[PDB]
Coordinates of N, CA and C in Angstrom, one line a residue:
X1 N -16.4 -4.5 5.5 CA -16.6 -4.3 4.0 C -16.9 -2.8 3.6
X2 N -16.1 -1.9 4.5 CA -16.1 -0.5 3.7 C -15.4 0.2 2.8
X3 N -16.4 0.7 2.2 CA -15.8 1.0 1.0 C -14.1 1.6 0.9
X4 N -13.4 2.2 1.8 CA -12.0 2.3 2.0 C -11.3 1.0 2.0
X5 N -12.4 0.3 2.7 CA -11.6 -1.1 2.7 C -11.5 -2.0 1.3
X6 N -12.4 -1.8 0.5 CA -12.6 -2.4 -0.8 C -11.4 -1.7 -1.6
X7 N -11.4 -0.6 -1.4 CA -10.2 -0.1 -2.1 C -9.0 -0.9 -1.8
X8 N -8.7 -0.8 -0.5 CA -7.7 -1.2 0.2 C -7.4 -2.7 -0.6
X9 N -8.8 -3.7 -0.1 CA -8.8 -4.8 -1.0 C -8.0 -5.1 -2.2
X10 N -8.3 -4.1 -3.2 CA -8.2 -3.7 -4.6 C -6.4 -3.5 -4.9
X11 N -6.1 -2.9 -3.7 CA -4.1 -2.7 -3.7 C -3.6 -3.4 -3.5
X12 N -4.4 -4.2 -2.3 CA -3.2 -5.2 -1.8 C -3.4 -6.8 -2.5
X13 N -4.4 -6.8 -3.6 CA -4.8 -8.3 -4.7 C -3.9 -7.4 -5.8
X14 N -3.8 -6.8 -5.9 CA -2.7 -6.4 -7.3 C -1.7 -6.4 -6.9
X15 N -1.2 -5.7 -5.2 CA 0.1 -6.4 -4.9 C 0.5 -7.9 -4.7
X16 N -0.2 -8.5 -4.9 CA -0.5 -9.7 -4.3 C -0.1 -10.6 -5.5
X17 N -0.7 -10.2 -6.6 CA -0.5 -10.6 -8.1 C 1.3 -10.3 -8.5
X18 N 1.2 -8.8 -8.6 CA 2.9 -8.5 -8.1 C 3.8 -9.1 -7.8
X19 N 3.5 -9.9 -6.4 CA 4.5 -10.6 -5.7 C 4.9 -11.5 -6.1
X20 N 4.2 -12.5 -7.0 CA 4.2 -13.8 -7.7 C 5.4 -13.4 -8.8
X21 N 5.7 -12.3 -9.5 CA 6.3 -11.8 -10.2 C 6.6 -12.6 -11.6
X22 N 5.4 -12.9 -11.9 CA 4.8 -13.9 -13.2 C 5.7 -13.3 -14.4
X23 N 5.4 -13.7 -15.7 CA 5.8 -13.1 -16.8 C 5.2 -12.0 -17.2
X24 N 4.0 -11.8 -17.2 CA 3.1 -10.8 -17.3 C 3.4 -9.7 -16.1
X25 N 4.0 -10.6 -15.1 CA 4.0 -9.1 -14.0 C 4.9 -8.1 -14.5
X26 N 6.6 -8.8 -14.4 CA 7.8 -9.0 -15.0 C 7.4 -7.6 -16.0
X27 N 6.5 -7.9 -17.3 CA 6.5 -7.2 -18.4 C 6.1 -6.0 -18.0
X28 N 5.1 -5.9 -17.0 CA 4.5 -4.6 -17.1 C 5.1 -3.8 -15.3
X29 N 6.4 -4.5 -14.9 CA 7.3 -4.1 -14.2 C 8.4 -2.7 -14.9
X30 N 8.5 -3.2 -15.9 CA 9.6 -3.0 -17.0 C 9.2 -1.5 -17.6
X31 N 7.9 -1.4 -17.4 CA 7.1 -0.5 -18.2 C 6.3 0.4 -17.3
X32 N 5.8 1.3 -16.8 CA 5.4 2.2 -16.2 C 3.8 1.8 -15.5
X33 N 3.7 0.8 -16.1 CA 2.5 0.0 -15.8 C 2.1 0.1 -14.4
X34 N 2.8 -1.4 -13.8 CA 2.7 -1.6 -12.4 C 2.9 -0.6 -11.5
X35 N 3.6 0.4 -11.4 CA 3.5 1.5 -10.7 C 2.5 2.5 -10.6
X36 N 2.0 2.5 -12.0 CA 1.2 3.6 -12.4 C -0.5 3.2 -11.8
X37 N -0.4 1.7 -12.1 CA -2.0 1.5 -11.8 C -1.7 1.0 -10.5
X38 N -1.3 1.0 -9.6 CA -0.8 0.9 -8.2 C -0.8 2.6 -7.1
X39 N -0.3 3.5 -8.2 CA -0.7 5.0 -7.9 C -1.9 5.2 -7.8
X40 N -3.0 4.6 -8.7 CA -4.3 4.8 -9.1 C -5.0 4.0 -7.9
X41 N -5.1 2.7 -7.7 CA -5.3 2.3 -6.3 C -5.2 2.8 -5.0
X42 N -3.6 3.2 -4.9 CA -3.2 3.8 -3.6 C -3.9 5.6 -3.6
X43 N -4.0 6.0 -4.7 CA -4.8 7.1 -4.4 C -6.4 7.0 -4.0
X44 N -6.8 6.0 -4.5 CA -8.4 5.6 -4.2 C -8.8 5.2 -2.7
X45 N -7.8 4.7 -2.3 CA -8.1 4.3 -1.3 C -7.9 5.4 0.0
X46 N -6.7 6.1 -0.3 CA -6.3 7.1 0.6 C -7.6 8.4 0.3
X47 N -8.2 8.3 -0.6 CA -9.6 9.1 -0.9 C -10.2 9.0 -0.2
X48 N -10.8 7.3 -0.2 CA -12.3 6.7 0.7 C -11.9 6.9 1.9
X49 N -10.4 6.5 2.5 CA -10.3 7.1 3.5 C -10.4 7.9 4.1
X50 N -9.7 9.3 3.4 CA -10.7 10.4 4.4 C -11.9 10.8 3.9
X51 N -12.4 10.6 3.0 CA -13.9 10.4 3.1 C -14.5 10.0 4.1
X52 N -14.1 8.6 4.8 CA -15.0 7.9 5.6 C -14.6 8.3 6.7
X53 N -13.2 9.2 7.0 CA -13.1 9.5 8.2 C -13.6 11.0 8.7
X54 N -14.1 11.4 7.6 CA -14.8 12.8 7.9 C -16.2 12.3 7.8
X55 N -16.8 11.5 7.6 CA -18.1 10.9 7.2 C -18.5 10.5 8.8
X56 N -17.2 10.2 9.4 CA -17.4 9.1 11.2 C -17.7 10.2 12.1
X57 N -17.1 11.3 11.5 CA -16.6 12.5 12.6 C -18.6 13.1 12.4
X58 N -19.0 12.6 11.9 CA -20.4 13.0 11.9 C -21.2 12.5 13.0
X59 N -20.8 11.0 13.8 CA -21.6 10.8 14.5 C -20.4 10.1 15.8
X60 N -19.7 11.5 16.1 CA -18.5 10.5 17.3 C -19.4 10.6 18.5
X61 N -19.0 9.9 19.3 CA -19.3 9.7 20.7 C -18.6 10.9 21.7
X62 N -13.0 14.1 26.7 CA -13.1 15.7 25.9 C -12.2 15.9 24.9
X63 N -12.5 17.0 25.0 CA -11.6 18.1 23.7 C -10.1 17.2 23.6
X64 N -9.6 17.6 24.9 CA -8.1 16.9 24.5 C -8.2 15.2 24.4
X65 N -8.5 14.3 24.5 CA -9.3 13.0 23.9 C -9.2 12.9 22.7
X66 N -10.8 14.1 22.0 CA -10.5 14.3 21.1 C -9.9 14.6 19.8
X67 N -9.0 15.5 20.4 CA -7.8 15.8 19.8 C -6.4 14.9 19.5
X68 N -6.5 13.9 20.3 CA -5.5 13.5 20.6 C -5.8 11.8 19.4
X69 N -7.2 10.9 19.6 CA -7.1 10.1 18.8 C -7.5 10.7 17.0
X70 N -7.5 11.9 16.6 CA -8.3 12.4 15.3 C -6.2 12.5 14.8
X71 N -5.5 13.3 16.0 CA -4.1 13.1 15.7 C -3.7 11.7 14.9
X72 N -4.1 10.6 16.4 CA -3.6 9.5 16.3 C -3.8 8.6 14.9
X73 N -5.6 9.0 14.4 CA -5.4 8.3 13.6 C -5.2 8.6 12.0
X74 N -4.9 10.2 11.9 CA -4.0 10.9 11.1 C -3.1 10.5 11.0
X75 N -1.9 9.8 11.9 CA -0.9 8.9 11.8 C -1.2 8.0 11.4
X76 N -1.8 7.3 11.9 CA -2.5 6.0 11.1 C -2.5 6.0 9.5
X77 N -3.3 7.1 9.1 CA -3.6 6.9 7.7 C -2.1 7.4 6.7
X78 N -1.2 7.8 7.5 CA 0.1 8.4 6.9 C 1.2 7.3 6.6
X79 N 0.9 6.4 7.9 CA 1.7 5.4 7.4 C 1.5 4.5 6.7
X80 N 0.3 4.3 6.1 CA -0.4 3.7 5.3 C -0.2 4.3 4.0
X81 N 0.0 5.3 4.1 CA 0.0 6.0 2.3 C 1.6 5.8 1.9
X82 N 2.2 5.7 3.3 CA 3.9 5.9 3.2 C 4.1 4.4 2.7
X83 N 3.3 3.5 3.3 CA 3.8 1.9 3.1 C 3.8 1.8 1.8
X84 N 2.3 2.2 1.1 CA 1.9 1.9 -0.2 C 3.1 2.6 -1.0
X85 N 3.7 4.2 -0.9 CA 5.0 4.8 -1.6 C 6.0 3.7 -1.7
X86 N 6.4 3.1 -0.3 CA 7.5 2.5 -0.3 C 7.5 1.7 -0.9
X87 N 6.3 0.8 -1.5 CA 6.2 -0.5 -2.4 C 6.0 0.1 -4.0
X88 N 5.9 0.9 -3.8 CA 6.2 1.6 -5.3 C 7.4 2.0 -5.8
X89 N 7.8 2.6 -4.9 CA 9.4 3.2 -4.6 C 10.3 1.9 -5.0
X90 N 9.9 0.8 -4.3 CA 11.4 -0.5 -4.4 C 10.8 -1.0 -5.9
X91 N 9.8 -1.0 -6.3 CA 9.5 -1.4 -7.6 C 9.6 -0.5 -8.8
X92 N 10.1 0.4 -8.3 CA 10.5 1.7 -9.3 C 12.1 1.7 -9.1
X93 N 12.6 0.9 -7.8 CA 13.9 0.8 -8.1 C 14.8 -0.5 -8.8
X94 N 13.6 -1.7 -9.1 CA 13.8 -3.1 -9.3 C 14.0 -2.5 -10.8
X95 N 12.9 -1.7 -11.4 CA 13.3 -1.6 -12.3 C 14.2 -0.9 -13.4
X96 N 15.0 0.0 -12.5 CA 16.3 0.7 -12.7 C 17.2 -0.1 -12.7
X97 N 17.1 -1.1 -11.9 CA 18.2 -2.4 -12.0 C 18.5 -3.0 -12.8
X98 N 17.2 -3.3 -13.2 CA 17.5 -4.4 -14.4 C 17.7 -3.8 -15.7
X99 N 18.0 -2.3 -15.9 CA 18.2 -1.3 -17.1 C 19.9 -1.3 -16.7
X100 N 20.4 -1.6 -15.2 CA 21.7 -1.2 -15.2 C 22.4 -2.6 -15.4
X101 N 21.5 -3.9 -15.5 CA 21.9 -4.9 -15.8 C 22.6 -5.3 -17.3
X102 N 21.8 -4.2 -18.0 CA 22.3 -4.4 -20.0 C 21.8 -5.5 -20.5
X103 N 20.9 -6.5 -19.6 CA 20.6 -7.6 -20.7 C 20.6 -8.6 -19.7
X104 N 21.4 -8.5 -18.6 CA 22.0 -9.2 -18.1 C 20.7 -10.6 -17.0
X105 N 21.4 -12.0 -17.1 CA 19.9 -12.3 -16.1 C 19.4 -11.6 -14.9
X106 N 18.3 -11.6 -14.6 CA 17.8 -11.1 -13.8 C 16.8 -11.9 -12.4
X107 N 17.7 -13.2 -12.6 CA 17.0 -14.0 -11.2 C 17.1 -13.6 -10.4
X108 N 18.1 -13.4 -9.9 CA 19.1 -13.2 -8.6 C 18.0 -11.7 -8.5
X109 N 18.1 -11.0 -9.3 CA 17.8 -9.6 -8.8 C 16.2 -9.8 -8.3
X110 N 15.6 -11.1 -9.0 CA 14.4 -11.2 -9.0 C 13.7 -11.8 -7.6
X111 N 15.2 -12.5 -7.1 CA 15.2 -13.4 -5.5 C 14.9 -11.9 -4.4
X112 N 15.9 -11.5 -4.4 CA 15.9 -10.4 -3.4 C 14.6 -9.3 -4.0
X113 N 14.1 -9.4 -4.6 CA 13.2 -7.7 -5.0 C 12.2 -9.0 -4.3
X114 N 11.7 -10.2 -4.7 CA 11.0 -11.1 -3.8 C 10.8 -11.1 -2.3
X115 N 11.7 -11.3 -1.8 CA 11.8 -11.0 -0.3 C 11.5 -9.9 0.2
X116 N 12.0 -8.7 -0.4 CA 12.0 -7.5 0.3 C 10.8 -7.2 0.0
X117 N 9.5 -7.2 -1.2 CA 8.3 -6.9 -1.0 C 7.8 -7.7 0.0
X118 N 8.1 -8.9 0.2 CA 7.4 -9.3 1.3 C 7.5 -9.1 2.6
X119 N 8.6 -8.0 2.8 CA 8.4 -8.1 4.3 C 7.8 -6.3 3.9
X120 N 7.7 -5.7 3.1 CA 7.0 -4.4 2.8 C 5.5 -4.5 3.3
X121 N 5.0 -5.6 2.2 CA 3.7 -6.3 2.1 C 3.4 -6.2 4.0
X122 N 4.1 -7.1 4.7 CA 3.6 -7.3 5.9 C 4.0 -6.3 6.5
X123 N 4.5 -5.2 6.4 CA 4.5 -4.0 7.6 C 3.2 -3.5 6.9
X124 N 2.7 -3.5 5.4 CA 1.4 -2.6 5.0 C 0.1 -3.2 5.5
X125 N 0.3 -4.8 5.8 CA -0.8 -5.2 6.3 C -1.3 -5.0 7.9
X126 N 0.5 -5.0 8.3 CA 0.4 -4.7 9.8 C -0.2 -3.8 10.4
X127 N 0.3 -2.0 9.3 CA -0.3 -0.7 9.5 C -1.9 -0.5 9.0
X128 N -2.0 -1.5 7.6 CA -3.9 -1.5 7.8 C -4.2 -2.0 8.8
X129 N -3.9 -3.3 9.5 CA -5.0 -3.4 10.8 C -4.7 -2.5 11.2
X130 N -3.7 -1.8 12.1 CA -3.7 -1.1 13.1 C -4.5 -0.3 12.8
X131 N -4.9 0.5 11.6 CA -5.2 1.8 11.4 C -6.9 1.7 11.1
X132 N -7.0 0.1 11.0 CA -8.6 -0.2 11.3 C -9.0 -0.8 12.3
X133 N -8.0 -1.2 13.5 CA -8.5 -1.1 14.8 C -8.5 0.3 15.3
X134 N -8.2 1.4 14.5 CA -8.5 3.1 15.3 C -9.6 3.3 15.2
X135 N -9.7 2.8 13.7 CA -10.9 3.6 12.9 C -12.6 2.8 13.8
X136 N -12.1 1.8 14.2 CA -13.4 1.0 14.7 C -13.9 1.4 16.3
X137 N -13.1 2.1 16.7 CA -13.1 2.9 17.8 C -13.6 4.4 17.6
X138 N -12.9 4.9 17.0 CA -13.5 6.2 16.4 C -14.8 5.9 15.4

């Protein structure tokens, strides 16, 4: 329950809400909304992040070791920020779609932007664990 993680919490229950792609989601898909307060999460958390990970570096337990997991779990935290872009990114593209639709229904488009967050969703959950089994080591 640290505070990175509460953030994290915080992205992935609004993505979560997202995915359901309710009428209320839908609306503020359409609108700069969802993306925008999804920026505002995904930056908070990538904050606490290295907050906490300069906070750990306070009390670590050689050099090239060193060097080598502070690397590793700088990757860690990269793909993590990349995951969270890329679920912004396809939702910044769902809704270009439905502007090139003209009016047009939007289930079908609504099936597939469904699926594909979800397998987004699970590579972002995949890369949070991983990147909090580093952190619990470091």
């Amino acid at each position: 329950g640290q505070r990175w993680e509460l953030a994290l919490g915080r992205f992935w229950d609004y993505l979560r809400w997202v995915q359901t792609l309710s009428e209320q989601v839908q609306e503020e898909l359409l609108s700069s909304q969802v993306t925008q307060e999804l920026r505002a999460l995904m930056d908070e958390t990538m904050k606490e992040l290295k907050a906490y990970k300069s906070e750990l570096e306070e009390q670590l337990t050689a050099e090239e070791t060193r060097a080598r997991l502070s690397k590793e779990l700088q990757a860690a935290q990269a793909r993590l920020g990349a995951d969270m872009e890329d679920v912004r990114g396809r939702l910044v593209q769902y809704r270009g779609e439905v502007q090139a639709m003209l009016g047009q229904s939007t289930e079908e488009l609504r099936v597939r932007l469904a699926s594909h967050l979800r397998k987004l969703r699970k590579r972002l959950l995949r890369d949070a664990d991983d990147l909090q089994k580093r952190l619990a080591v470091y």
